[PDB]
Amino acid sequence: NTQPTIRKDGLKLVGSWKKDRATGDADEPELRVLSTEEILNIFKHISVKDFTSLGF
Amino acid sequence: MIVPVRCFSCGKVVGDKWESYLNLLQEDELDEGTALSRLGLKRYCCRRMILTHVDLIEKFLRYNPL
Amino acid sequence: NQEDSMIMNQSSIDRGLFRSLFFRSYMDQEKKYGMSITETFEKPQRTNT
Amino acid sequence: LKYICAECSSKLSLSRTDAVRCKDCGHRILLKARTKRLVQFEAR
């Protein structure tokens, strides 16, 4: 999968999935608000050694 | 390419005898003549196919499928 | 049968006499001009081509 | 339920611009997964 670029606005986090997997360039990114629950879920899955690497 | 059914000449049910013919010719080492005769094919019309059929399907099936 | 013609049993044909398979194939692939301005393999819409 | 290649017949199920080569093996065959539809043939 492709990690979208993350931009900041007020108290929300948005991501730009450019995604370009069409034969044509298809410049059409998706601006989707990262729902906090999915961020919490993905954080729950981080390896313990990552914390040490990530300074946690 | 299995034994056909329904002799082109007559149409009698043929093919159900295939296993019997194969084994009979094998463990009893009789000639085809008596083999087909006891098989019960008096007319030669049926006789031709069982006489001159090649079951290619064996050579087919040797391939690992998929 | 006059003049080298012949007659064959409809019923025999029915039962399988002289039946035949028949195979045709087709060839196709993409094309390149760059700077890959290439074609595609997809159902074109009415208002496309 | 979209693509199968030779002798490692696992469901490839690739979609588009997605590394045509088989995941499992280095084959490049990819048979096209005969339809789930139904057909009519005549006994004759």
Ligand SMILES: [Zn+2]
């Ligand atoms: Zn017969």
Ligand SMILES: [Zn+2]
């Ligand atoms: Zn493979």
